[PDB]
Amino acid sequence: STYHLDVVSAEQQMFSGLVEKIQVTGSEGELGIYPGHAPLLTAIKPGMIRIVKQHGHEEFIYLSGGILEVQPGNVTVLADTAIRGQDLDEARAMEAKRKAEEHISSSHGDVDYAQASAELAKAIAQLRVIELTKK
Amino acid sequence: STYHLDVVSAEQQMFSGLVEKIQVTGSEGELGIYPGHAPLLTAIKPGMIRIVKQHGHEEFIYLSGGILEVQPGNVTVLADTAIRGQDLDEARAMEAKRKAEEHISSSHGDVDYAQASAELAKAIAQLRVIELTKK
């Protein structure tokens, strides 16, 4: 019915308590972790983690990347950079998307494109969290 | 009597408004910036910025590093990683200090020491902000 979740970064402890479920942006694709899920160790791609706290209440946190560790009764997500949805800045994310979008139409190769493509994923991800929080 | 301050990072806008003064950890040493200060462009060393908002009220933000831009009437600090003092985690910072302190007594050279020495500066800095916030 519930399991323990620890969302931490090198400096902060974003979350620590009981949740009913979470959705992360795993290495293999979108992941849904429930109570009693089988052990797992995966890398997180720049995106977000939806935390469904007990009583069916949500909290959104943007993850630039990190590591997901599912273990018996305990789940831990070590984040590179983690920012709460209410703290993201729309103008700042919008800005990033622009710098990236033009980095794309500057691609003199296929190496610099994948890097501008990465930059964009992060920007798109931030905007998704921003909008998901408003609701 | 007052000047405009913008504290921003790639994703967030930590602060934006009128302040009476600020103290950053500049490239040359601790800096005090007041209204009417002469133009400056400096790099910020891992440390903190004390924001003295109008009415003599303080707010502490940890900076892993960044850039300080003093211009007529407007002051901007672009941060690499910025975390509000109330969001730092003492156990997490304490942890970092330990990993660093032992990285030091592992120094097989003078190259790896300066890197462990850097890691420690950041950890010490975080703890300073944490304690400065409590007060």
Q: In Å, what resolution does this model reach?
A: 2.3
Residue A57, Cβ density class (10 Å: 0-12 exposed, 13-18 middle, ≥19 buried): exposed
Nearest to B88 among A11, A87, A89 (CB): A11
Q: How many CB atoms within 10 Å of residue A59? A: 18
Strands B3-9 and B74-79: parallel
Domain containing residue B20: CATH number: 2.60.15.10
Residues of B in contact with A126 (CB under 8 A): 11
Method: X-ray
Domain housing A67: 1-88
- Counting Cα atoms < 13 Å in the Cβ hemisphere of A10 gives 18
Number of domains making up chain A: 2
Domain containing residue B112: CATH number: 1.20.5.440
Query: Domain check: are B83 and B40 in the same one?
Result: yes
Give the minimum alpha-carbon distance from A117 to chain B in angstroms, rounded to a whole number: 17
A96/B10 touch (CB, cutoff 8 Å), yes or no: yes
Query: Domain check: are A64 and A110 in the same one?
Result: no
Nearest to B51 by CA among B40, B64, B62: B62
- Counting Cα atoms < 13 Å in the Cβ hemisphere of B13 gives 12
Alpha helices (runs of H) in chain B, residue ranges in sequence order: 90-104, 111-134
Nearest to B31 by CA among B72, B69, B58: B69
Query: Domain check: are A83 and A104 in the same one?
Result: no
Query: Domain check: are A72 and A97 in the same one?
Result: no
Query: Domain check: are A98 and A59 in the same one?
Result: no
